Design an enzyme around this catalytic site. Structure first.
Site, PDB file in Angstrom:
ATOM      1  CG  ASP A 168      -1.820   1.081   1.385  1.00 61.58           C
ATOM      2  OD1 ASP A 168      -2.404   1.533   0.396  1.00 61.58           O
ATOM      3  OD2 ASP A 168      -2.092   1.511   2.533  1.00 61.58           O
ATOM      4  CG  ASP A 189      -2.045   7.675   0.541  1.00 60.10           C
ATOM      5  OD1 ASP A 189      -1.129   8.518   0.523  1.00 60.10           O
ATOM      6  OD2 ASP A 189      -2.980   7.560  -0.311  1.00 60.10           O
ATOM      7  CG  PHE A 209      -9.245   4.069   6.686  1.00 59.57           C
ATOM      8  CD1 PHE A 209      -7.931   3.678   6.742  1.00 59.57           C
ATOM      9  CD2 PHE A 209      -9.774   4.445   5.473  1.00 59.57           C
ATOM     10  CE1 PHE A 209      -7.171   3.645   5.635  1.00 59.57           C
ATOM     11  CE2 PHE A 209      -9.020   4.415   4.318  1.00 59.57           C
ATOM     12  CZ  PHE A 209      -7.684   4.012   4.409  1.00 59.57           C
ATOM     13  CD1 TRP A 210     -14.166   5.953   6.747  1.00 59.81           C
ATOM     14  CD2 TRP A 210     -12.839   6.694   5.101  1.00 59.81           C
ATOM     15  NE1 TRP A 210     -14.193   5.030   5.731  1.00 59.81           N
ATOM     16  CE2 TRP A 210     -13.398   5.460   4.706  1.00 59.81           C
ATOM     17  CE3 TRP A 210     -11.942   7.334   4.243  1.00 59.81           C
ATOM     18  CZ2 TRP A 210     -13.108   4.868   3.474  1.00 59.81           C
ATOM     19  CZ3 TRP A 210     -11.636   6.746   3.036  1.00 59.81           C
ATOM     20  CH2 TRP A 210     -12.241   5.532   2.643  1.00 59.81           C
ATOM     21  CB  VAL A 211      -8.636  12.118   8.007  1.00 60.21           C
ATOM     22  CG1 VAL A 211      -8.343  13.490   8.572  1.00 60.21           C
ATOM     23  CG2 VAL A 211      -7.386  11.245   8.087  1.00 60.21           C
ATOM     24  CD1 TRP A 225      -8.516  14.384   0.308  1.00 61.45           C
ATOM     25  CD2 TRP A 225      -8.017  14.499   2.470  1.00 61.45           C
ATOM     26  NE1 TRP A 225      -9.658  14.077   1.030  1.00 61.45           N
ATOM     27  CE2 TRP A 225      -9.354  14.128   2.365  1.00 61.45           C
ATOM     28  CE3 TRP A 225      -7.448  14.626   3.734  1.00 61.45           C
ATOM     29  CZ2 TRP A 225     -10.163  13.917   3.508  1.00 61.45           C
ATOM     30  CZ3 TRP A 225      -8.233  14.413   4.858  1.00 61.45           C
ATOM     31  CH2 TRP A 225      -9.575  14.044   4.730  1.00 61.45           C
ATOM     32  CB  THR A 238      -1.825   3.430  -4.170  1.00 59.94           C
ATOM     33  OG1 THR A 238      -2.222   4.641  -3.549  1.00 59.94           O
ATOM     34  CG2 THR A 238      -1.432   3.801  -5.583  1.00 59.94           C
ATOM     35  CE  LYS A 297      -5.470  -0.233  -1.932  1.00 63.23           C
ATOM     36  NZ  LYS A 297      -4.365   0.261  -1.078  1.00 63.23           N
ATOM     37  CG  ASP A 324      -2.954   2.628   6.255  1.00 59.72           C
ATOM     38  OD1 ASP A 324      -2.950   2.330   5.049  1.00 59.72           O
ATOM     39  OD2 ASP A 324      -3.258   3.739   6.735  1.00 59.72           O
TER      40      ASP A 324
HETATM   41  C1  LIG Z   1      -6.070   6.732   2.287  1.00 57.80           C
HETATM   42  C2  LIG Z   1      -6.853   7.527   3.138  1.00 57.80           C
HETATM   43  C3  LIG Z   1      -7.652   8.533   2.587  1.00 57.80           C
HETATM   44  N1  LIG Z   1      -8.441   9.356   3.450  1.00 57.80           N
HETATM   45  C4  LIG Z   1      -9.274  10.447   2.976  1.00 57.80           C
HETATM   46  C5  LIG Z   1      -8.945  10.815   1.568  1.00 57.80           C
HETATM   47  C6  LIG Z   1     -10.261  10.749   0.845  1.00 57.80           C
HETATM   48  O1  LIG Z   1     -10.302   9.525   0.280  1.00 57.80           O
HETATM   49  C7  LIG Z   1     -11.614   9.013  -0.089  1.00 57.80           C
HETATM   50  C8  LIG Z   1     -11.542   7.677  -0.507  1.00 57.80           C
HETATM   51  C9  LIG Z   1     -12.714   6.911  -0.432  1.00 57.80           C
HETATM   52  C10 LIG Z   1     -12.727   5.581  -0.823  1.00 57.80           C
HETATM   53  C11 LIG Z   1     -11.565   4.974  -1.281  1.00 57.80           C
HETATM   54  N2  LIG Z   1     -11.655   3.686  -1.613  1.00 57.80           N
HETATM   55  O2  LIG Z   1     -12.716   2.798  -0.844  1.00 57.80           O
HETATM   56  O3  LIG Z   1     -10.897   3.194  -2.586  1.00 57.80           O
HETATM   57  C12 LIG Z   1     -10.375   5.728  -1.349  1.00 57.80           C
HETATM   58  C13 LIG Z   1     -10.358   7.085  -0.957  1.00 57.80           C
HETATM   59  P1  LIG Z   1     -12.412   9.939  -1.457  1.00 57.80           P
HETATM   60  O4  LIG Z   1     -13.837   9.659  -1.125  1.00 57.80           O
HETATM   61  O5  LIG Z   1     -11.937   9.234  -2.660  1.00 57.80           O
HETATM   62  O6  LIG Z   1     -12.052  11.357  -1.433  1.00 57.80           O
HETATM   63  O7  LIG Z   1     -12.468   9.006   1.074  1.00 57.80           O
HETATM   64  C14 LIG Z   1     -12.629  10.289   1.669  1.00 57.80           C
HETATM   65  C15 LIG Z   1     -11.257  10.900   1.975  1.00 57.80           C
HETATM   66  O8  LIG Z   1     -10.673  10.177   3.035  1.00 57.80           O
HETATM   67  C16 LIG Z   1      -8.407   9.149   4.756  1.00 57.80           C
HETATM   68  O9  LIG Z   1      -9.084   9.824   5.477  1.00 57.80           O
HETATM   69  N3  LIG Z   1      -7.620   8.157   5.324  1.00 57.80           N
HETATM   70  C17 LIG Z   1      -6.842   7.355   4.527  1.00 57.80           C
HETATM   71  O10 LIG Z   1      -6.174   6.496   5.096  1.00 57.80           O
HETATM   72 MG   LIG Z   2      -3.230   3.148   3.186  1.00 60.92          MG
END
Ligand SMILES: Cc1cn([C@H]2C[C@H]3O[C@](c4ccc([N+](=O)[O-])cc4)(P(=O)(O)O)OC[C@H]3O2)c(=O)[nH]c1=O
Ligand SMILES: [Mg+2]
Ligand SMILES: Cc1cn([C@H]2C[C@H]3O[C@](c4ccc([N+](=O)[O-])cc4)(P(=O)(O)O)OC[C@H]3O2)c(=O)[nH]c1=O
Ligand SMILES: [Mg+2]
Lengths: 201, 201
Positions: free
Chosen positions: B15, B17, B49-51, B70, B104, B139, B150
Site C-alpha cells: 500500500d 498512503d 480510517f476516515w480522517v 488532500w 494504491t 484491491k 493500513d
Molecule cells: C487513504 C486515506 C484517505 N483518506 C481520505 C482521503 C479521501 O479519500 C476518499 C476515498 C474513499 C474511498 C476509497 N476507496 O474505498 O478506494 C479511497 C479514498 P475519497 O472519497 O476518494 O475522497 O475518502 C474520503 C477521503 O478520506 C483518509 O481519510 N484516510 C486514509 O487512510
Molecule cells: Mg493506506
C-alpha cells in the site's frame, strides 16, 4: 450490477485504448495535422501492436515524432469513443451478477495520461464509474473471468491469469491468426453478451 | 526480482498512503498551517480510517476543510516517506522470487492525485519502478500472496481475495483488536522478511 451478500458476480475487465477509445484514429489524425510533410501509415496498413515501431521503420526519426503525439496534452482526453463502446459498457454494467472494470495501462510519460483517462471515463460514464478504473502496466495480476483487450499477447508476473483474454479486433490485429481456442470480439456490434454468458455458472 | 520462465514468484502488494507515504502527518501539518484557528486531532488521538469523519465530529464544517487539504495540488507529491519504507521496498524488490507492486487507491478528485502518486514513486524508487504501480479503488480484484495495508477492512467485488492482508500499523489503527489469525506489520523496522517467508513454498 454487484452480486448479493458475499456472492460472486461475473467479472469483466474492459480495456480502454483500442476497445473504448479510438487511439489509432486519434493518433493518425493528430500525427497528420502536426507532421503534414511526413509519410504516415493508413489504418488499413497498420501491423503490430506498437505504432512507434512501424513508424520507425517507415522513416528514421518518425518513431520519436509518433511518440510525441501521445505524450502531448489532451491526446488521451480527446480520443473519440469506438462505435457502440459506451452504450455496450453501460448496458454490461447494468446486467445482473456482472461487475465491469476498465483495466488500462498508462504510457510511460505520466504527466497527462492517468489524469486524462480518469477524465475521459467521467465524461462518458459519469462520476460513479470512476470506482471501476484499474490502472496497471500488468493486467495478469488483475483477477476476472474475462479480459476484452486489443493487444494480442498479454503477459506479466502471473503466468496463469484467471481471465480468458478475448481479443478485440483493431486495425493492427485484424489479420492475426490466433491459437485455438482463443476467441475474438470483432466490434461492439458483435455479440458480447454471448461471450459473457459462456462464462457464467 | 521476477521468477524464471513461466515460474511463480511470491507476489506482494504494498500500500502507499500510511505504509510508504506519511498521509496522516502530512495532512495534520498542512491542516494546521492552513487553518491555524481550528481545532485539530493529534495523531495519538486519531481513531477510524476516515480522517474527515473524525474531523467532522470535532466541529461542523471541518470535514470539508479537511478534504480541501488532500484535494490540494502537491499534497500527495510532498508526503514524506515513512521511516524505513523506501529502503525496505527496495530490498524486497531485489529478493529472489519476489514481485512487488505498489497498490494504491486514488481519492475521488483526480486532478492531481494519480499524477502525483506516479511522480512520488519515480522520485523515491526511480523510473523503472513505475511499472509496479497499480491504481485501483478495489484491491480485492488484484491477486497476490500478501497485501500490506493500513486500512483495517479491505473489501470489494471479490469476496475471497487471494492475498493475506497484513495490517500495517498506523495511528488510526494501533489500538484495534483483530480477529485471529489476522496479523500486523508494526512498522518497516519490524520483521517483514519473516512475514514474506511464511508465504513461500
Ligand atoms: C487513504 C486515506 C484517505 N483518506 C481520505 C482521503 C479521501 O479519500 C476518499 C476515498 C474513499 C474511498 C476509497 N476507496 O474505498 O478506494 C479511497 C479514498 P475519497 O472519497 O476518494 O475522497 O475518502 C474520503 C477521503 O478520506 C483518509 O481519510 N484516510 C486514509 O487512510
Ligand atoms: Mg493506506
Ligand atoms: C495502447 C497502445 C499504446 N501504444 C504506444 C503508446 C506508448 O505506450 C508504451 C507502453 C509500453 C508498455 C505498456 N505496457 O506493457 O503496459 C504500455 C504502454 P510506453 O512505453 O509506456 O510509452 O509503449 C510505447 C508507446 O506505444 C501503441 O503504440 N499501441 C497501443 O495499442
Ligand atoms: Mg488496448
Amino acid at each position: 450490477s454487484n452480486a448479493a451478500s458475499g456472492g460472486r458476480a461475473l467479472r469483466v475487465l474492459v480495456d480502454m485504448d483500442g476497445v473504448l477509445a479510438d487511439f489509432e484514429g486519434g493518433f493518425l489524425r493528430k500525427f497528420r495535422a502536426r507532421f503534414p510533410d511526413q509519410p504516415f501509415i493508413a489504418l488499413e496498413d497498420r501491423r503490430g501492436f506498437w505504432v512507434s515501431e512501424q513508424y520507425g521503420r517507415l522513416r528514421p526519426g518518425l518513431s520519436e515524432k509518433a511518440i510525441s503525439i501521445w505524450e502531448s496534452k489532451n491526446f488521451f482526453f480527446e480520443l473519440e469513443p469506438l462505435p457502440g463502446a459506451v452504450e455496450a459498457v453501460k448496458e454490461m454494467a447494468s446486467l445482473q451478477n456482472t461487475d465491469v472494470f476498465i483495466c488500462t495501462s498508462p504510457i510511460k510519460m505520466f504527466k497527462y495520461c492517468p489524469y486524462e483517462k480518469y477524465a475521459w471515463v467521467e465524461k462518458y460514464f459519469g462520476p460513479d464509474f470512476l470506482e471501476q478504473i484499474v490502472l496497471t502496466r500488468d493486467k495478469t495480476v488483475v483477477s476476472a473471468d474475462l479480459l476484452i483487450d486489443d493487444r494480442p499477447d498479454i503477459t506479466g508476473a502471473e503466468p496463469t491469469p484467471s481471465w480468458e483474454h478475448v481479443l478485440f479486433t483493431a486495425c493492427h490485429n485484424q489479420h492475426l491468426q490466433l491459437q485455438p481456442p482463443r476467441r475474438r470480439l470483432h466490434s461492439w456490434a458483435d455479440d458480447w453478451k454471448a461471450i459473457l454468458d459462456s462464462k457464467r455458472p
